Amino acid sequence: PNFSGNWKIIRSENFEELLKVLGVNVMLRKIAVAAASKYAVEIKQEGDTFYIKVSTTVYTTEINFKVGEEFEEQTVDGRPCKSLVKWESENKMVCEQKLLKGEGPKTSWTKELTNDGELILTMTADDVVCTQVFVRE
Ligand SMILES: *C/C=C(C)/C=C/C=C(C)/C=C/C1=C(C)CCCC1(C)C
């Protein structure tokens, strides 16, 4: 549907706790939380093909996928992984990830477009769920 847009963050909950589960030490967690306050998501959607560009003040990364096809990206804490996105309803998709090398927490994310025009992202590591809410620029 209309995931396409330039999204700007308005709320971020449990992000520090997510990073803690992921092994990031406290000073870097605090700096990462501060960096999440500037952060923007740009989405281009055509059918079930998505282009996503995530950017903060000094860093930017692009994610390209088709729903239902495995692709490679990185976990939140930077460990490369294989990902697979599926729809869960009209305007929510869920991505499951598997580490390429090694072991670690089970991670995943979801992206939802609400009826009131917000984008909700969740990122999960084991039992900890980070929720971020965006509005269009
Ligand atoms: C569909 C939207 C997705 C998959 C968004 C992914 C977002 C990230 C991988 C954000 C990561 C960040 C850090 C790892 C620390 C700096 C702040 C963030 C939130 C940009």
Angle, CA 134 vertex, CA 123 and CA 15 arms, to 5°: 35
Quote the CA–CA distance of 10 and 135 in Å, as a whole number: 7
| Sheet-wide strand order for 80-89 | 60-66, 49-55, 40-46, 5-13, 128-136, 119-125, 107-113, 92-99, 80-89, 71-74
Do 43 and 50 form a contact (C-beta atoms < 8 A)? yes
For the CA of 9, the closest atom of ligand 1 is: 19
CATH of 1-137, one of 3.40.350.10, 3.40.50.300, 3.30.420.40, 2.40.128.20: 2.40.128.20
Quote the CA–CA distance of 76 and 58 in Å, as a whole number: 16
Quote the CA–CA distance of 104 and 18 in Å, as a whole number: 13
Pocket of ligand 1 (CB under 6 A): 32, 35-36, 39, 41, 52, 54, 56, 63, 76, 109, 111, 121
| Placement of tokens 């009826």 in the chain | 115
Gap from CA of 89 to ligand 1 centroid (Å): 23
In angstroms, this model's resolution equals: 2.1
Closest C-alpha to ligand 1, atom 7: 54
Closest C-alpha to ligand 1, atom 9: 76
Domain ranges in the chain? 1-137
How many residues belong to the chain? Answer: 137
Reading phi first (left if > 0) and then psi (alpha if -120 to 50, else beta), residue 48 is in alpha
